[PDB]
Write a structure and sequence with these properties.
The complex is a heterohexamer, with three copies of chain A and three copies of chain B.
Chain A lengths: L4 H5 L12 E6 L4 E5 L1 H18 L19 H52 L3 E3 L4 E4 L5 H8 L5 H13 L1
Antiparallel strand pairs in A: 1-2, 3-4
Helix pairs in contact in A: 2-3
Chain B lengths: L1 E6 L6 E4 L4 E5 L2 E3 L1 E2 L6 E2 L5 E3 L7 H4 L14 E4 L10 E3 L2 H9 L4 E5 L7 E2 L4 E6 L1 E3 L4 E3 L1 E2 L9 E6 L6 E9 L3 H8 L6 E4 L4 E4 L15 E9 L4 E6 L3 E4 L1 E5 L4 E4 L4 E2 L6 E3 L2 E2 L6 E2 L6 E2 L3 E2 L6 E3 L9
Parallel strand pairs in B: 5-28, 6-25, 7-8, 8-24, 9-20, 28-30
Antiparallel strand pairs in B: 2-3, 4-31, 10-23, 11-15, 12-13, 14-22, 16-21, 17-20, 17-22, 17-23, 18-19, 18-21, 26-27, 26-29
The chains are: A mainly alpha, B mainly beta.
The complex binds a molecule of 3 linked components (NAG-GAL-SIA) (3 copies) and 2-acetamido-2-deoxy-beta-D-glucopyranose (NAG) (6 copies).
The site of a molecule of 3 linked components (NAG-GAL-SIA) has 15 residues of chain F, from strand 12 and helix 3.
C-alpha cells in the first residue's frame, strides 16, 4: 500500500469480519466484541464499483469484414490488412494490460487509504483520552464499557466526559 | 482497555497484477477478457438471410441455387462455405469489393432493364445450370448469332437509371473453348464489348482456349459490374461473346454480412459475430477471434487480465 | 480560542468524470475536445492555388479551364467540386494515385519533350475544348492520319529525362465511336500503342464503340501516366488512336492538397483543414471531422471531455 | 479524496475565501478573521498548470488525404481505409477518455493532499500548545491575539513562548 | 511529492547516506551517528524494480515488410501504408510519453510515501516520550545513549522504560 | 537530545518528466528508447540466405546470377540492392505480392512439370543470359516456331499439382521489338495465351514494339504467376510468344525476409532488423527506424524518455 495500513502497521486482516470491509474490534471488561463500519465500507465499495461501471463498457462502433476466410483476398491487400489488424492488436493488448495494472495499483491504494482515514477519524475522536499502541489499537486510559465503545463506533464519543479521569490515568 | 481498527481477509484470495508487483493477492477480482463463445449465430430480432448454397454474388446473376434469393431483404446476411456464385464456370472481377457492397446492402431489389433484341437468339442454355432441363442465369441472357456460324450484328443497348440510388449492373463475357466454338456461337472476327457511362470506361474481348474442366465445362464466363449513378445511362456496344443483363439491382438499405459454419439461433441476441459463433459479453476485451465483426469487445492477445475488485488480502497468520 | 484550516468553494462548480465517479463537481474545469470550426480556408502566409474549375489532373493535360494553371506553384492546393479534369470526355487510369502525387508536388514545371512528326497531321481539335474556336488539350497533340482514311505509319518517339528528378509523362488513347470512325481518323487495322522505360512495360489498343454522350461526345480518351526516373528514356511505339504528350511535368517541391467548398481567408492562419474549413485549436482532440488533414488535434468520437483544473467543490451548506 | 481532507474531515469549503485555494480562519478575542495561504495555493496551482501545459499539446505530424470526397476511391481500398481510420478513432477516443479520467482523479487527489500537508504543517508548528478538534481546527489552549494568529499563518509561531501556560491550561 | 516528505517537511536529502535510501541520524551525548533503514529502502527498491521488470518488456509479435525500399510499391497502396504506419507511430509515441510521465509521478510519490511511513512508525514507536520538532526529528525528552538509539533503529525501543522520566521531563 | 529521519541525495541527479512537471531531478533514471544500432545483420543460429546479386523473383525463373539459389532453404532471406530478377529485360505482374510470398516461404523446392512438346523448337536463347555462351532462364523454355517464319500450332499443356501444398506457377510473354520479329519467331496472326485453373481466369496477347534498350535488348518478357491449389490443374492454351515453365515451385516452410546493405554477422543474435542493421535491445521503444521488421521495440518519434528509478533528488544546501 501507499498509505501504510492495509499491509502496513496493521498487517493482519480479520477473516472473522464477514459483514464489512472495515471494523472495530475492542475488549473492555465485558469481554471482546467485533463490529463493521458501514460508512468506510460503503465508500470503498462505491469507488470500486465506479471503476467497474466505467470499464464494463460497450463500444457502439460497428466494424465490418474487410477480408474473407472462404476465398482469400489478393495477397498484397491481404498483407496490408493483416499488418494493420496485428498493429491494432498490439495497441489494444498494451492498453488492456496497462489499464488493468494501473487500476489495480490504485484500487489497492484507495482501500489502504480508506483504512487510514477511518483510523485517523477515531484518533481525532478520542482526543487526549487515548494513546496509539502502534498496531491499529487505541489504548484507552479510562473505563470504556460496551456503551462507550459503541459511542466510539457510531461517532458520538464525547472526549470531555472522561478527559480529567483519562488524563490523570495517563500521567501518574 | 483497548479498541482496534482493522480490515477483512479471506483464506482464498485472487492474485492480480499491478504496476509494481506480479501476483499480489486481493480479496476479490473479476475478469476483463472474454473467453466464452456461443457456438451459434444469435439472430433474435434480426431479419436474417442464410445463403446456404447460394453464393452472395449469385444473388445478382441467378444460378439455380440462388433462385430463392434474387430479391432478398435482410439485416444480417450469412455466407456459407458450401455457397457458390456460379453454375456455368466463371468468376467476377473485383469480386470482393462487390461482396462488401452486398453484405451491407440490406438486400437487393431487381428491376427490368428493358433490353430488346433483333437479329439474334437470346436463349443460350447449358447443363451446368439445370432448372429441370438445361437453363442459364435467371437474371441474364446468353446472346447468340441467330444460327450456327452466322454474323453477330454489332448492336448497342442502353439503360438509364431513372431511380434515386445507384444501379448495380452486371454483364458477362463468354470465353469459348476455342475460336472454332466462338465462331459457331457468334461468328468470326475479334469480338469487342464496350461499356461506358458518365464515370466509367472499359472494354473487353473474348479469350477462347481450353481450360480446366469445371462443372463439366472448359469454357468460362467473366462477370463484370459497375454502379450507375441516378439519372446516368449505361451503354453496351457489343458484337458477340456477351452475357447480357436482363435486370439491374438496387440496394434496399443497410445490413451486416458474416461468414459462419454454425447454426442460426433465434433464442439468443448478439451484436458480435465470428465464423464460430456469437460473442455475447459486456467485458471490454476478448481473446476469441481477432476477425470478429459487428459491435465487439476489443481483441487482445492475452487470455486473462484480472481486475481487482477488493483490497489487498493479508491473511490471518 | 481556535484556528481553522479550510479550502475554497463556489456556488457554481463544473461536473467532470474520474476513474471512480461520473459527474464529480470541481471548482474549475476546461475543455479538451475542439468543437468550433472556422468556415474558411485560413491561408495567411501560404502560397495558395485555388483550382476552382480546373481539375487537378487537368493541370497536366491542359483543358481550357486549366490554362492559367499549367505551371502552378503552391504550398496549399485547393480542389473544388466544380473542377473538371477533362474537356473531351475521358478519364485517367490510377487517377487518385496521380491526384496524391500532385497534391504534395508544390506545383509543376513544364518542359517540351521535343517530339517531331512526319507523314501525319498533328492538329486534331474538338468543340468540347473551346478556346475561341474548337481546340484541344494545351499540353497534348491529337495525331491523325494525314487525310481521311489514310494509313498511320507505325512511328516511334523517345524522350530522355535529362533532369535530376523524375518526369511525369502522360499520353492518351482515343476510343472512337466506331471502327468506321477509327478508320477515318487513323486507317484500318488493330492499332497498338507500346510504352516502355527501364522500369515500365505496358500496351494499349483502342476500343471503338458507342458510349453515353458526355460534353456532346460519344468517344472517349483514356489518359495514362508514368514517372521517368532521371537519365532514363521513355519510348512510344504507336500506329494510331494516340494522344501524344507535348510537354512533360516536373515537380517543384512539396505542398499539401485539400478539398473544400469554403472561401480562402488570408486573415487567419491554420494548419488543420477539412472540406468545411479550418480547425484552429491548441486542444489535443477534435470532434469536427475525422478526415481533417494537415497538423490536427486527434479526432475522437466524444463531443466533450472536461479536464478538471481545480479541486473538488464541496459547497457551503 | 485519497487523503481524507477536501471532502473528508473538513467537508466544507468556504465560498468566502476568494483570494486563495487554502486559508486560515480563526477567532480569538478581537473577533474572527480569514486569510489565504499563498504557498500551498501556489503549489496546487503550479502542479495543475503543469498538467495543462502537458496536455494542451500540438502534434507536429502532418497527415495527408488518402481518399476523396468528390470522387469516391475504389471500393476495396476505400473499405480498408475506412476500417483503418475507424480503428484509430476507437484507439484515440479510448485514450482521450482514459487520459481525462485518470488526470481528474489525480488532480482532485493532489488538491486534497495539499490541504492535508498544510494542516499537518500547522499541527507540527503548534507542538504541545494545541489540540485537534477533528473538523480542521486547532483548539489553542492559551491566549492568541491577532499577532499570534499571524505568527501561525506566516510560519513564525514559537511554541516555547506559550508552552508552560498552554500545557497548564490543558491539563488542569 | 504527494505525501509531503521527500521534498516537504524534511526538504533536505543527505548526500552522506550512501548505504540506503532512508536513514536515522541522531545526536545524543556520545556525539552524532548516521545509519540506514534496510526495510524501507528495500520496499522502495523492490517496488521500483517491479516497475522496471514490467516495462523492459519484449513483445513476441513479428511484423513483416509490407513495402520496399529498393523498388517503390505502387503509389496508392504505398500512401495508405505510409498513412497507417504514421498513425500507429502517433499512437505509440503518445503511449510511451504518457506511460513514462505517469510512472515517474507515481515513482516519486511512492518514494515520498515510504519516507512518511517510516517516520510515522518511529513516532508511534516512541509513544509519549518524544515530541515532533517539525523537520523530521523527534526531540526525545529523556537520556537516550547509543544503545537506546539503536533500539529505536532496530525496532525494539520500549516506551514504558522511560515513560515516567520522559513525561516528567516534558511537562515540568 | 534528538533523532532525525531523512532520505538520500546526490550532487549529480537526472532530470525526468512527470505529469505535473518537466525536468524534475531524481536520484537515478534509465532510458526507455533504444538509440543504438548494430550495423550488421545478426544471424547467429539462423539459416541465412544472402541473395546478393540474385533478385528474389529470379529464384523462380533462374537468370544466371540465381543459379546457386534455385532451391534455397532459409529462415532469414536477405535482399540486396545489387540484386536483379532478370537477365533478358522484363518484369513480373504483382511483383511485390510475390516478393512477400517468397520472403516468408522458408525457401523453395522445384519440381518438373513434365511439359513435352511437338512441332516447335524449345531452345530459345539470348546474350543477355550468358552461361558461357548465350542461354536463357534455367527454369523456363523459350518456345519458337520450328524454323524462321513458320506457324506456331495452337497447343495446350496441363500440369496437375499432385502435392499437398500449393504450387507456384510462372510463365512469360515475349514482346518482340516488332510484328516483323514476332512473325520470324512465332509466325503471323494475333497470338493468344489462355491460362485457367479451378479459381483462375486470365488471358494475354503480345505487344510487339520498340522499347528502351535494357541489357542490350529492346524486347521484353512479361512474367506472370499463380498458385495451384493441391489436386487442382493448370491449363495453358497458347500459340506463340510464350515463355513456358519447366518446373514449378513449392514452399518449404516459413521464414522472414529483410532488405539490407550491411554484412552478415554470425557472432551476434537479433530478432529486430532494418536496412542498416540489427536492433538488439530489451527496451520497449526505439527511435532508429520505423520500418524495422521482426520482433522489435515499438517505434516512437522521441529520441529519449527517461524513466525515474529513484526518488526525487533534493540536494544538500
Ligand atoms: C457451341 C457448341 O455447340 N459447341 C459444342 C460443344 O457444346 C460440345 O461440347 C460438349 O458440351 C456438352 C454440353 O454443352 C452444351 C451445354 O449443355 O453446356 C449444350 C448447350 O446448348 C450449349 N449452349 C450454347 C448457348 O451454345 C453449350 C455451349 O456450346 C458450351 O458450354 C460453350 O463452351 O454446350 C458437354 O459439356 C460435353 O461434355 C461436351 O463434349 C462439342 C462436342 O463435344 O461440340 C462443340 O461444337
Ligand atoms: C472522324 C470524324 O470526322 N467523324 C465524324 C464525326 O465527327 C461526326 O459526329 C459529329 O461530331 C460533332 C463534333 O465533332 C468534331 C468535334 O468538334 O469534336 C469535329 C472535329 O474536328 C473532329 N476532330 C477530329 C480530330 O477528327 C471530332 C472527332 O471526329 C470526334 O470527336 C471523334 O469521335 O468531331 C458533334 O459531336 C456532332 O454532334 C456529331 O454528330 C459524324 C457526323 O454526325 O460523322 C463522323 O464521320
Ligand atoms: C528473331 C530474330 O532473330 N530477330 C533479329 C534480332 O535478333 C536482331 O537484333 C540483334 O539481336 C542481338 C542479339 O539477339 C539475339 C540475342 O542474343 O538475344 C540472338 C538470339 O538467338 C535470339 N533468340 C531467339 C530465341 O530468337 C534473340 C531474339 O531474336 C531477340 O532477343 C528477341 O527480341 O536475339 C543484339 O541485341 C543486337 O544488338 C541486335 O541488333 C536483328 C538484327 O539487328 O534482326 C532480327 O531479325
Ligand atoms: C492473413 O491472416 C490470416 C489469418 O489471420 C491467414 O489465414 C491469411 O492467409 C493471411 N493472409 C496472407 C498471409 O496473405
Ligand atoms: C467479486 O466481484 C464480482 C464483480 O464485482 C462480483 O459479482 C462478486 O459477487 C464479488 N464477490 C464477492 C464475494 O464480493
Ligand atoms: C478555469 O480554467 C481555465 C483554464 O485553466 C482558465 O483559463 C480560467 O481562467 C479558469 N477560471 C478560474 C475562475 O480560475
Ligand atoms: C468511407 O466513409 C465515407 C464517410 O466517412 C463514406 O462516405 C464512403 O462511402 C465510405 N466508403 C465506402 C463505403 O466504400
Ligand atoms: C512512403 O514513405 C517512405 C519513407 O518512409 C518514402 O520514401 C516513400 O516514397 C513513401 N511513399 C510514397 C510517398 O508514395
Ligand atoms: C540506475 O538505474 C539502472 C537501471 O535500474 C541501474 O542499472 C543502475 O545501476 C542504477 N544506478 C544506481 C547508482 O543505482
Amino acid at each position: 500500500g501507499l498509505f501504510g495500513a492495509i499491509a502496513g502497521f496493521i498487517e493482519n486482516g480479520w477473516e472473522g469480519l464477514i459483514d464489512g470491509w472495515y471494523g472495530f474490534r475492542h475488549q473492555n471488561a465485558q469481554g471482546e466484541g467485533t463490529a463493521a463500519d458501514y460508512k468506510s465500507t460503503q465508500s470503498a465499495i462505491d469507488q470500486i464499483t465506479g471503476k467497474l461501471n466505467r470499464l464494463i463498457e460497450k463500444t457502439n462502433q460497428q466494424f465490418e469484414l474487410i477480408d474473407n476466410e472462404f476465398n482469400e483476398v489478393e495477397k498484397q491487400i491481404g498483407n496490408v490488412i493483416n499488418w494493420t489488424r496485428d498493429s491494432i492488436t498490439e495497441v489494444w493488448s498494451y492498453n488492456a494490460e496497462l489499464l488493468v495494472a494501473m487500476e489495480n495499483q490504485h484500487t489497492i491504494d484507495l482501500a489502504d487509504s480508506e483504512m487510514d482515514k477511518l483510523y485517523e477519524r477515531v484518533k481525532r475522536q478520542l482526543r487526549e483520552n487515548a494513546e496509539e499502541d502502534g498496531t491499529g489499537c487505541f489504548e484507552i486510559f479510562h473505563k470504556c464499557d460496551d456503551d462507550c465503545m459503541a459511542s466510539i463506533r457510531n461517532n458520538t464519543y464525547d472526549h470531555s466526559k472522561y478527559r480529567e479521569e483519562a488524563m490523570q490515568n495517563r500521567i501518574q | 482497555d483497548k479498541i482496534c481498527l482493522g480490515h477483512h481477509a479471506v483464506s482464498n484470495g485472487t492474485k492480480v497484477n499491478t504496476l509494481t508487483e506480479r501476483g499480489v493477492e486481493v480479496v476479490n477480482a473479476t475478469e476483463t477478457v472474454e473467453r466464452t463463445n456461443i457456438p451459434r449465430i444469435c439472430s433474435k430480432g434480426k431479419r436474417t438471410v442464410d445463403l446456404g448454397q447460394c453464393g452472395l454474388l449469385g444473388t445478382i446473376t441467378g444460378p439455380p441455387q440462388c433462385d430463392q434469393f434474387l430479391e432478398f431483404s435482410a439485416d444480417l446476411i450469412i455466407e456459407r462455405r458450401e455457397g457458390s456464385d456460379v453454375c456455368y464456370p466463371g468468376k467476377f472481377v473485383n469480386e470482393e469489393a462487390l461482396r462488401q457492397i452486398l453484405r451491407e446492402s440490406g438486400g437487393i431489389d431487381k428491376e427490368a432493364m428493358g433490353f430488346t433484341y433483333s437479329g439474334i437468339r437470346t436463349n443460350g442454355a447449358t447443363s451446368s445450370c439445370r432448372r429441370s432441363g438445361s437453363s442459364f442465369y435467371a437474371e441474364m441472357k446468353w446472346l447468340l448469332s441467330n444460327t450456327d456460324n452466322a454474323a453477330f450484328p454489332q448492336m448497342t443497348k442502353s439503360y438509364k437509371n431513372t431511380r434515386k440510388s445507384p444501379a448495380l449492373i452486371v454483364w458477362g463475357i463468354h470465353h469459348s473453348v476455342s475460336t472454332a466454338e466462338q465462331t459457331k456461337l457468334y461468328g468470326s472476327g475479334n469480338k469487342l464489348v464496350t461499356v461506358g457511362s458518365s464515370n466509367y470506361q472499359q472494354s473487353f474481348v473474348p479469350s477462347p482456349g481450353a481450360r480446366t474442366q469445371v462443372n463439366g465445362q472448359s469454357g468460362r464466363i467473366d462477370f463484370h459490374w459497375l454502379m450507375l449513378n441516378p439519372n446516368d445511362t449505361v451503354t453496351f456496344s457489343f458484337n458477340g461473346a456477351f452475357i447480357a443483363p436482363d435486370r439491374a439491382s438496387f440496394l434496399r438499405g443497410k445490413s451486416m454480412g458474416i461468414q459462419s459454419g454454425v447454426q442460426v439461433d433465434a433464442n439468443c441476441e448478439g451484436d458480435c459475430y465470428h465464423s464460430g459463433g456469437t460473442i455475447i459479453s459486456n467485458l471490454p476485451f476478448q481473446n476469441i477471434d481477432s476477425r470478429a465483426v459487428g459491435k465487439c469487445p476489443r481483441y487482445v492477445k492475452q487470455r486473462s487480465l484480472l481486475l481487482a475488485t477488493g483490497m489487498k488480502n493479508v491473511p490471518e497468520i
